[PDB]
Every structure is written in structure tokens, then in C-alpha cells.
Amino acid sequence: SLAGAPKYIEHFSKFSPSPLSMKQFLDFGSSNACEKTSFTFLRQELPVRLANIMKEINLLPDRVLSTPSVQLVQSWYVQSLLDIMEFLDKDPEDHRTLSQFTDALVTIRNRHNDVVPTMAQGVLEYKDTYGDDPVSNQNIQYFLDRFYLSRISIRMLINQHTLIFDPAHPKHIGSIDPNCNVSEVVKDAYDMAKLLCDKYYMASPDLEIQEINAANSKQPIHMVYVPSHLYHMLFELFKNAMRATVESHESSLILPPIKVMVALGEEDLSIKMSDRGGGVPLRKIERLFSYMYSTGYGLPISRLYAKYFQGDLQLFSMEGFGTDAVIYLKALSTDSVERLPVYNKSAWRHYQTIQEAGDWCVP
Amino acid sequence: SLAGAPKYIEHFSKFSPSPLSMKQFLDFGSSNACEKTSFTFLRQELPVRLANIMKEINLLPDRVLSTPSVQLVQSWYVQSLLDIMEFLDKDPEDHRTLSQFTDALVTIRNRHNDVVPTMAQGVLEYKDTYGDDPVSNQNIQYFLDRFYLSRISIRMLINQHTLIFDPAHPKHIGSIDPNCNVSEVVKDAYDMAKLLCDKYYMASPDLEIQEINAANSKQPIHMVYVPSHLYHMLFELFKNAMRATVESHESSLILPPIKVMVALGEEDLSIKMSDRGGGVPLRKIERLFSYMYSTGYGLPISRLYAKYFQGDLQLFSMEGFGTDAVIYLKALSTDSVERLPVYNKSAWRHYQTIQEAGDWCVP
Ligand SMILES: O=S(=O)(c1ccc(O)cc1O)N1Cc2cc(O)cc(O)c2C1
Ligand SMILES: O=S(=O)(c1ccc(O)cc1O)N1Cc2cc(O)cc(O)c2C1
């Protein structure tokens, strides 16, 4: 009873995704009136977001698109879009519509659970089948950043709806904590990373945390954020910092600690993790965020989580000494706005590159 | 007796500049035989470098190219190219050729002494005459990085020739010190910056230096480098770090020191300058390297000096606390290779951009 998927994809890809702020997410209520509004919003917005990214998948090199794992992920997106199309003519006033809608979103979330490693298998299939080439590699890098950020945003919308309209912390709004204690999340991530480090190395660096609350020196630092995302970033950073520290100190019984500073400024909430794990030459930094070289998407996905609400995650090393990693977040919920890729001329132009000599000299 | 400048520009712009390594610069001798070789090399290479960048000047927006200061700089480049064309048919075996050539290079260097602020006046003329627009601004940013790096490389070639073939430190090869003591340059830059800070604020932060020589912990860190370039970068960084520190501490008599770490690894020699000057939000970092917003090209030019021998200069702040600046240099003279822009299809494509919506969403 549905139209062919391409007809829906073309229709919805004409719209731009609509970025929401953390404050907008937070201010959304839980009444039946609010549930109807979420329904009518999401039966438009989710198809817009699904269609936009599906259109970019089609711009990938034939080589990457031809891989079975990429085709598999594509087929999931198609079915998920069609699942939502079933709701276009349904009455929001009917309670069964709303309950059925929530069930459909859960089914979609589950269907897409393994998207990240499935796409990674696609990248490997491309490399194995054809060998890699720099042009395709740049396109893959550009696309995957956008694809995975898209996915993060779709999961955010779905989680907010299912959590609110279907508990450990009742004070949270869906997955959002209006009073996230940053140092507590740092400690939780450290604890879990230490378990792993201790298992493999029988030792781990200690943690030291310092807070700089610029405007209110005595006050513990809190923010509006999704604690699971913050935890994810910190856990990945701790794993890298711990491994560097232990491996660079094979001979020592004394390990330098990992030092974390949490700073709260007027605009930024910044978290720096400093290790003395011997560092890495500058030349090798970019590789850490590469889907190719690391095909372990922990660091690039962590940086996407940071970028998702207008933040960033940056690494600066001193070879021979150690490495600083900094998570930059927006301090204010009103500045914390979804960063969403959009399918348009500008996007389309990025996949329209070819092999040639660079604009810089080689000997 | 010369052809029209465009005929020479077209001829020489077909070649790519030839990047030399620090080791190649260093290994060049001072005999009459070596002077002839430098002559025959430079009467080709300097025209290639002049022509390549002149071709890119022509790709600038009409608006920027139409400014009197940009046209003035263009006219200097034309005359300098023609000055060298006078030497195409001259005999390297004739001592007068060589002496005349050195005189011509000195005249060129002097002619171009004020290129940096003259171009900056061009940018201001563009802004005043037309108002600025984002497309032109991006083109200006791209071009100026390349133009000023080009200029650095041309001045390097000229200085090496005139210094070698026409002293405080006789151990230097032209402007290159094969045994540059990095901490000594840090101290020299600090001393000069402190003079300025003390003049205006009647106080300045102290300096602390720590060295990490990974492979040889006891040994003072030395490298092959051009000390004036290193001094330039450190002086600019100290001025910023000092101003931040004093201005963020208006009420205090105790100023936090500026801490410098010099680390020597297998591949990198890294110099970190850390201040507690209160920092800056991430949003405002990019502006520091902008020719537009800072129209004070101290930071962007400093970063070009770092990039010139395959290094970099990076800033990471923690708003509410302070800022780290890191100069990344190649530890090895063989890795220290000129980074030279080249005029080709790839370069040409960058000026072929236009106004449109970005590939990312706006609310
Ligand atoms: O690149 S690192 O500087 C680094 C990268 C990311 C990060 O968040 C922290 C880091 O120290 N590091 C050095 C090293 C040495 C090892 O022996 C094993 C490692 O996993 C590593 C990792
Ligand atoms: O951007 S900063 O963090 C900075 C930029 C570059 C650098 O090398 C060091 C820095 O601290 N800094 C803060 C601030 C406050 C002032 O009142 C005056 C200043 O000049 C500044 C400069």
C-alpha cells in the first residue's frame, strides 16, 4: 500500500533537517498533547533526516556503494523510511496511532543497532576488493563524518521520544540531564577504563581532577547535557591515555597520573585530559581520526559526539612527553544546537573531486 | 631589450618551484664554483617562484585586485622578475656577472621590504571600498597564506645567496644555524617581549623553561634551523601570552609565569608555551589566524614560518583558565623541506567558488 521507496526519498530529501537546541529538547513535555505534537513532528522530521543522508550514500564511489555491507545498511534505511510512511495518514487523536508509532521507532532503533561496525565492514570490503585510493578515501572520510553524525541525531530524536513517552533518574528529560555533574561523569569513565587497564597491565595511572569555575570559583561545575555522550567521549580518551602511559613506562612501577581539568567559562565548558604517555609525532595525529587507517572508530565517533552540539574534540601531542586531549562543549543550553549535515549543491560538490597534483609542491 | 613581462610570466609559470631541504641549504658551499652554481640555479628558480605566485594574484576577486596597494605589490613583482631576466644571457664565468647578480638580489629584497603591510593595506582598501563578503574573504585567506609563504621562500633563497656570497656567527651557513640552541632562542624572545610588557604594564610574568630530551635526557636540545624565524614565532607568542596574563590579572601583584616546554622526539621538536591568561572561547580561535578580522598579522605569519619547513603552530585554549600554543618543528634537517605553493589546476580551482548555502544545517 506504500509507494516505492525512491518516490519518498526524493520527496523528503527536498527539505532540510531542522536542528533543535538542547534547551528545546529539555523544554518538551510529557502530556498526551505533547505526545501528539512529537508524533506529528517526527513523522515529518525523521523521514527528512533519513532521506537526506540516503541521498548522500548514493554519491559514494561505485566501489564503496557496491560492497555488501554498505548495501545492507542502505536496505535498513529504506525499510525504516517505509515504516514511518505507514503513519502519514494516521490520526494523532487515536491512542493506538501513538502507541504503534512508539513501537515502530523502537523497531527502527533496534534494526540500526549495528550500523557503525557494519559500515566499517563496508570500508574493509572496499579495501579488500579494490585496494584503496586517495580520492575514494577522502570521499569516505567526508561521507562517514556526516553519515555517523546524521545517525547520532536520528538516535537522539528516537531516544527522546521513547524515553519520554514510554526510572533511575526521573529528573532527566529523556536522555538529557539538566544538572549533569561533569566531574562525576569523568570519574565514572575513569573507573571503567581503569578496570580494563588493570585487567591487561595489572596497573593503571591514578586520576587527578581540577575544576576552574571562572565566574564562581567555589561552585561544582554542572551543565545541561546527555551524560551517556559525555561518558562515551571520556571513556575513549581514558583508554588511550592509560594505554599510552603504561606502555611508555614498561620499566617503571611508578606511573604518572592522568590529569583532568574541567574549566567553565562564559561560553565554553572545556575538559582537558593530559597524559605523559610519550606522545606521538604530529604527522600521525590525523590518522587517529581516520576511518581508513583505523580499519576502532572510538576517537572519530567521540569527536562527532562533541561536534553534535556545536563542540569539538581536539588532540595535541608533544612527541617524547605526552598528549593533551580537549573536549570543547557549549556551556549554555541555548548555544547547544544540533549540527546536522544537509543534502544540497554544496554537499553534492564534495563528492565531485578527482585525481590530480596538489596545490602544494613536492620535491 | 627585454620582452614584455607577461611573456616571461607565462613561460616561468609553467614550471613548479623546487623545494629544498634544510640539509641541502646547509650543504651548499662558498667557493667561486659554488657561486656560479647558485647563480645558474637562482636565475631559473627565482623567476619560477616569482611567476608562480604572480599567476595566482590574478585569480583574486576583481575587487581585491583593483586596490591600489595590491596593484603596487604586483608592480614590484613584475620589476623584480624583469631585473632577473637581464641575467638570462650573461656568462657565469664572468666575475662581474656574479657581483652584479648579488647587487640585483639586494635591490629586489629592499624593493619588497614592505610587502606584508602593503598587502594588508590592500585588504583594508577592499573592505573600505566595497565592504567585505564571505566568498572574497575565503579567497583572500587562501591566497594570502600562499602568497606570504611564497614570499618567505623567496627571501630565504635571496638571503642564503647574499649572506654566503657577500660576521657575528661565522659558523652559520647564511641564515642557518646548524647548532641552534632552542632554549637560548626562547630566552632571547622572552627578554624582548618582557621589555615591551614592562614598558606598558610595569610588570610581566616570569619565564620557566623545561626540556624533555626523550632519547638523551641530559643533553641540551639543539637543532638545525634559521634562528631569526624561530625567534619571530616565539616573540609573537610571548607578546600574546604576556598581554593575556597581565590583563586577566588586573587586581593581582602576583602573576602566574609563562611556562615553556621544549620536547625533542624522534621526529618532532615541539615547543609549548602555556599561559594562565584566562583564555578565549573556541569560537574565537580561528579569528586569530584571519587576515580579515586582524585587519596585526603576527600570528598568521608566525604559523607560516612554522609551516615553511613542514612544521605548524597550533593554539588550544581553555576559556576561564588560559592558553597553550605549540610550535611543531621537524627534528631532522632531512625532514625539513620547503613547503611551497604551486600554480596549477588544483590551486586554480580554489578561487572558483561562489555564494550558496553550506553543507551543514542552520536552524
Ligand atoms: O597517540 S597518543 O599519544 C594518544 C592518543 C589519543 C589520546 O586520547 C591520548 C594519547 O596519549 N598515545 C601514545 C601511545 C603509545 C602507546 O604505546 C600506546 C598507545 O595507545 C598510545 C596512544
Ligand atoms: O586569546 S588568548 O587566550 C591567547 C592567544 C594567543 C596566544 O599565543 C596566547 C594567548 O593566551 N589571549 C587572551 C587575552 C586576554 C586579554 O585581555 C588580552 C589578550 O591579548 C589576550 C590573548
Side-chain angles (χ1 to χ4, degrees):
Chain A
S1 80
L2 295 179
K7 195 168 194 164
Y8 295 116
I9 293 165
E10 289 299 308
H11 174 98
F12 287 104
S13 70
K14 294 185 180 186
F15 300 89
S16 168
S18 291
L20 303 172
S21 69
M22 187 80 63
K23 190 176 189 306
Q24 286 180 296
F25 277 121
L26 194 62
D27 292 347
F28 203 86
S30 56
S31 64
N32 168 255
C34 285
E35 190 174 1
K36 288 183 290 185
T37 296
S38 184
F39 169 66
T40 60
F41 173 70
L42 292 174
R43 72 169 170 191
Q44 170 75 11
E45 184 69 16
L46 283 175
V48 168
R49 297 188 187 194
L50 290 162
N52 267 249
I53 201 59
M54 296 162 83
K55 287 290 293 185
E56 277 189 56
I57 292 175
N58 291 345
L59 294 179
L60 283 167
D62 288 336
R63 291 166 181 225
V64 182
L65 267 179
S66 75
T67 65
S69 299
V70 173
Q71 293 283 300
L72 178 59
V73 171
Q74 185 172 61
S75 74
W76 293 343
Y77 276 70
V78 167
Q79 191 54 65
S80 293
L81 175 60
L82 293 172
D83 287 349
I84 301 173
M85 296 302 93
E86 290 287 359
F87 289 90
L88 290 184
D89 58 341
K90 302 203 158 184
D91 192 348
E93 296 292 341
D94 191 335
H95 87 86
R96 269 178 91 92
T97 296
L98 302 181
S99 62
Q100 288 174 5
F101 184 66
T102 296
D103 288 342
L105 295 189
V106 165
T107 294
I108 289 167
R109 184 175 56 216
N110 290 345
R111 184 182 292 131
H112 289 244
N113 223 63
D114 296 333
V115 163
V116 174
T118 301
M119 293 299 307
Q121 289 187 338
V123 171
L124 182 53
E125 286 145 22
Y126 143 76
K127 169 113 173 215
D128 289 347
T129 294
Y130 301 103
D132 63 304
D133 72 270
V135 176
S136 299
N137 283 358
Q138 291 173 43
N139 290 346
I140 285 163
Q141 189 67 30
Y142 176 82
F143 164 82
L144 284 180
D145 271 1
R146 295 163 60 82
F147 175 79
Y148 287 143
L149 189 48
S150 162
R151 179 167 178 278
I152 287 163
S153 81
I154 290 170
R155 298 189 107 252
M156 180 75 180
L157 293 187
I158 291 175
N159 288 333
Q160 288 304 104
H161 185 93
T162 70
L163 290 170
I164 295 177
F165 301 108
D166 213 31
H169 335 94
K171 296 154 162 292
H172 295 200
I173 306 301
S175 63
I176 295 173
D177 185 349
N179 192 226
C180 180
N181 183 319
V182 172
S183 284
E184 286 308 314
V185 182
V186 172
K187 291 179 185 182
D188 289 346
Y190 170 82
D191 288 343
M192 294 295 316
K194 167 174 166 61
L195 283 178
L196 185 71
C197 191
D198 283 346
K199 174 178 178 176
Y200 287 92
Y201 300 88
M202 207 172 278
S204 55
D206 288 340
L207 172 68
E208 296 178 7
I209 301 177
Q210 171 181 12
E211 296 197 1
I212 304 298
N213 188 332
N216 294 290
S217 87
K218 308 223 160 239
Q219 301 185 6
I221 291 168
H222 286 75
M223 71 180 305
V224 182
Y225 209 74
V226 180
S228 66
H229 292 192
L230 181 53
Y231 173 92
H232 186 284
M233 294 182 288
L234 289 161
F235 181 58
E236 178 68 26
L237 292 178
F238 274 124
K239 285 189 296 190
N240 288 279
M242 290 179 182
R243 186 173 182 177
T245 300
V246 298
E247 296 197 347
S248 64
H249 289 76
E250 287 175 0
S251 295
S252 297
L253 293 172
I254 299 173
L255 297 178
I258 295 173
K259 297 182 185 183
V260 174
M261 166 176 293
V262 180
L264 178 64
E266 290 293 304
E267 176 168 334
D268 295 348
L269 196 159
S270 313
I271 305 163
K272 173 180 287 194
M273 186 181 298
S274 298
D275 72 57
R276 293 176 187 211
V280 57
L282 181 57
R283 180 176 55 86
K284 294 187 180 182
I285 287 291
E286 177 173 40
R287 312 180 167 186
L288 294 175
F289 291 107
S290 171
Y291 296 104
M292 288 305 303
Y293 197 96
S294 78
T295 266
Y297 288 175
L299 288 171
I301 292 296
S302 289
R303 180 167 71 172
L304 297 182
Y305 276 115
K307 288 182 172 181
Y308 174 52
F309 286 113
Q310 306 295 322
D312 200 3
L313 189 165
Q314 295 181 2
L315 298 179
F316 5 102
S317 193
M318 299 278 288
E319 188 196 22
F321 179 71
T323 296
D324 283 352
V326 183
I327 300 168
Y328 293 101
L329 307 177
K330 294 295 192 185
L332 305 179
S333 64
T334 52
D335 288 342
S336 297
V337 173
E338 288 184 293
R339 159 141 271 235
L340 308 178
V342 57
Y343 178 74
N344 54 19
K345 209 189 218 221
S346 180
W348 168 93
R349 219 179 299 269
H350 277 268
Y351 300 89
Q352 315 313 319
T353 69
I354 303 126
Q355 191 66 71
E356 72 207 323
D359 48 340
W360 300 89
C361 279
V362 308
Chain B
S1 80
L2 295 179
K7 195 168 194 164
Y8 295 116
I9 293 165
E10 289 299 308
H11 174 98
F12 287 104
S13 70
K14 294 185 180 186
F15 300 89
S16 168
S18 291
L20 303 172
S21 69
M22 187 80 63
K23 190 176 189 306
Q24 286 180 296
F25 277 121
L26 194 62
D27 292 347
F28 203 86
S30 56
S31 64
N32 168 255
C34 285
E35 190 174 1
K36 288 183 290 185
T37 296
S38 184
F39 169 66
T40 60
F41 173 70
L42 292 174
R43 72 169 170 191
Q44 170 75 11
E45 184 69 16
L46 283 175
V48 168
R49 297 188 187 194
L50 290 162
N52 267 249
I53 201 59
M54 296 162 83
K55 287 290 293 185
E56 277 189 56
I57 292 175
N58 291 345
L59 294 179
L60 283 167
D62 288 336
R63 291 166 181 225
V64 182
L65 267 179
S66 75
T67 65
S69 299
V70 173
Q71 293 283 300
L72 178 59
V73 171
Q74 185 172 61
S75 74
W76 293 343
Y77 276 70
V78 167
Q79 191 54 65
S80 293
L81 175 60
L82 293 172
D83 287 349
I84 301 173
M85 296 302 93
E86 290 287 359
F87 289 90
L88 290 184
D89 58 341
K90 302 203 158 184
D91 192 348
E93 296 292 341
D94 191 335
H95 87 86
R96 269 178 91 92
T97 296
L98 302 181
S99 62
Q100 288 174 5
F101 184 66
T102 296
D103 288 342
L105 295 189
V106 165
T107 294
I108 289 167
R109 184 175 56 216
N110 290 345
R111 184 182 292 131
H112 289 244
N113 223 63
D114 296 333
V115 163
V116 174
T118 301
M119 293 299 307
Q121 289 187 338
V123 171
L124 182 53
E125 286 145 22
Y126 143 76
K127 169 113 173 215
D128 289 347
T129 294
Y130 301 103
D132 63 304
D133 72 270
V135 176
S136 299
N137 283 358
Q138 291 173 43
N139 290 346
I140 285 163
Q141 189 67 30
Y142 176 82
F143 164 82
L144 284 180
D145 271 1
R146 295 163 60 82
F147 175 79
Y148 287 143
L149 189 48
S150 162
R151 179 167 178 278
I152 287 163
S153 81
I154 290 170
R155 298 189 107 252
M156 180 75 180
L157 293 187
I158 291 175
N159 288 333
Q160 288 304 104
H161 185 93
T162 70
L163 290 170
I164 295 177
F165 301 108
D166 213 31
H169 335 94
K171 296 154 162 292
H172 295 200
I173 306 301
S175 63
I176 295 173
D177 185 349
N179 192 226
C180 180
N181 183 319
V182 172
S183 284
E184 286 308 314
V185 182
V186 172
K187 291 179 185 182
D188 289 346
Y190 170 82
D191 288 343
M192 294 295 316
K194 167 174 166 61
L195 283 178
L196 185 71
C197 191
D198 283 346
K199 174 178 178 176
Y200 287 92
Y201 300 88
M202 207 172 278
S204 55
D206 288 340
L207 172 68
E208 296 178 7
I209 301 177
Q210 171 181 12
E211 296 197 1
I212 304 298
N213 188 332
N216 294 290
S217 87
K218 308 223 160 239
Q219 301 185 6
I221 291 168
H222 286 75
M223 71 180 305
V224 182
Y225 209 74
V226 180
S228 66
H229 292 192
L230 181 53
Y231 173 92
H232 186 284
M233 294 182 288
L234 289 161
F235 181 58
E236 178 68 26
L237 292 178
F238 274 124
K239 285 189 296 190
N240 288 279
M242 290 179 182
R243 186 173 182 177
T245 300
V246 298
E247 296 197 347
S248 64
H249 289 76
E250 287 175 0
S251 295
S252 297
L253 293 172
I254 299 173
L255 297 178
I258 295 173
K259 297 182 185 183
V260 174
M261 166 176 293
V262 180
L264 178 64
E266 290 293 304
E267 176 168 334
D268 295 348
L269 196 159
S270 313
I271 305 163
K272 173 180 287 194
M273 186 181 298
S274 298
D275 72 57
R276 293 176 187 211
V280 57
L282 181 57
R283 180 176 55 86
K284 294 187 180 182
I285 287 291
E286 177 173 40
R287 312 180 167 186
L288 294 175
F289 291 107
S290 171
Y291 296 104
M292 288 305 303
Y293 197 96
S294 78
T295 266
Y297 288 175
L299 288 171
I301 292 296
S302 289
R303 180 167 71 172
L304 297 182
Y305 276 115
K307 288 182 172 181
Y308 174 52
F309 286 113
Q310 306 295 322
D312 200 3
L313 189 165
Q314 295 181 2
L315 298 179
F316 5 102
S317 193
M318 299 278 288
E319 188 196 22
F321 179 71
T323 296
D324 283 352
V326 183
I327 300 168
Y328 293 101
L329 307 177
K330 294 295 192 185
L332 305 179
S333 64
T334 52
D335 288 342
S336 297
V337 173
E338 288 184 293
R339 159 141 271 235
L340 308 178
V342 57
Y343 178 74
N344 54 19
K345 209 189 218 221
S346 180
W348 168 93
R349 219 179 299 269
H350 277 268
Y351 300 89
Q352 315 313 319
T353 69
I354 303 126
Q355 191 66 71
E356 72 207 323
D359 48 340
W360 300 89
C361 279
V362 308

